[PDB]
């Protein structure tokens, strides 16, 4: 009768395919008229139906396709970093998917994560975030990583990245407190 609705629920096949062939699950979720032809709807879908492979969304939201560098931009501008410290944005950003081991890709997201961070003081430019967004990636990676017996220290974490914005360095404090956030919690 009005269970005409339970038929769109079939948008499960689109994520069944998306999880292996992402360039398909989306292609299909339009041939049926389920997803927005435009991109903002794809950075959105990739933001809505969370039964999507958290590692398929990753690779997708970061490829070299004109359609992608934006499908991701609409995804970066769907995540609000309003009124919260850097560590969080990253925390709450890098939780919508799982970061891919592709070097040319990380920098894409880390460029429009940083660049867009500085849109919404302790930062000189947006290339300090994209360069601090790493000290934090290499932070949790080293510490919250079983095997590297010797875990990174404090007067080592901070003293290391001496000069993340311009010639001068970031307050030896932002670095301290940020240290006990990751030393306490693991973004991954």
UniProtKB/Swiss-Prot annotation:
UniProt feature coiled coil, ranges: none
Tissues where the protein occurs: Expressed in placenta, lung, heart, brain, kidney and pancreas.
Cellular compartments annotated: Cytoplasm; Membrane; Golgi apparatus; Cytoplasm, Perinuclear region
Cysteines paired by S-S bonds: none
Post-translational changes noted in the entry: In vitro phosphorylated by PKA reducing its GEF activity and dephosphorylated by phosphatase PP1.
Modified residues (Phosphoserine): 64
Residue intervals of the SEC7 domain: 18-145
Disease cited in the entry: Periventricular nodular heterotopia 2: A developmental disorder characterized by the presence of periventricular nodules of cerebral gray matter, resulting from a failure of neurons to migrate normally from the lateral ventricular proliferative zone, where they are formed, to the cerebral cortex. PVNH2 is an autosomal recessive form characterized by microcephaly (small brain), severe developmental delay and recurrent infections. No anomalies extrinsic to the central nervous system, such as dysmorphic features or grossly abnormal endocrine or other conditions, are associated with PVNH2.
Subunit text: Homodimer. Interacts with ARFGEF1/BIG1; both proteins are probably part of the same or very similar macromolecular complexes. Interacts with PRKAR1A, PRKAR2A, PRKAR1B, PRKAR2B, PPP1CC, PDE3A, TNFRSF1A, MYCBP and EXOC7. Interacts with GABRB1, GABRB2 and GABRB3.
Function: Promotes guanine-nucleotide exchange on ARF1 and ARF3 and to a lower extent on ARF5 and ARF6. Promotes the activation of ARF1/ARF5/ARF6 through replacement of GDP with GTP. Involved in the regulation of Golgi vesicular transport. Required for the integrity of the endosomal compartment. Involved in trafficking from the trans-Golgi network (TGN) to endosomes and is required for membrane association of the AP-1 complex and GGA1. Seems to be involved in recycling of the transferrin receptor from recycling endosomes to the plasma membrane.
Name recorded for this polypeptide: Brefeldin A-inhibited guanine nucleotide-exchange protein 2
Organism: Homo sapiens (Human)
Taxonomic lineage from the root: Eukaryota, Metazoa, Chordata, Craniata, Vertebrata
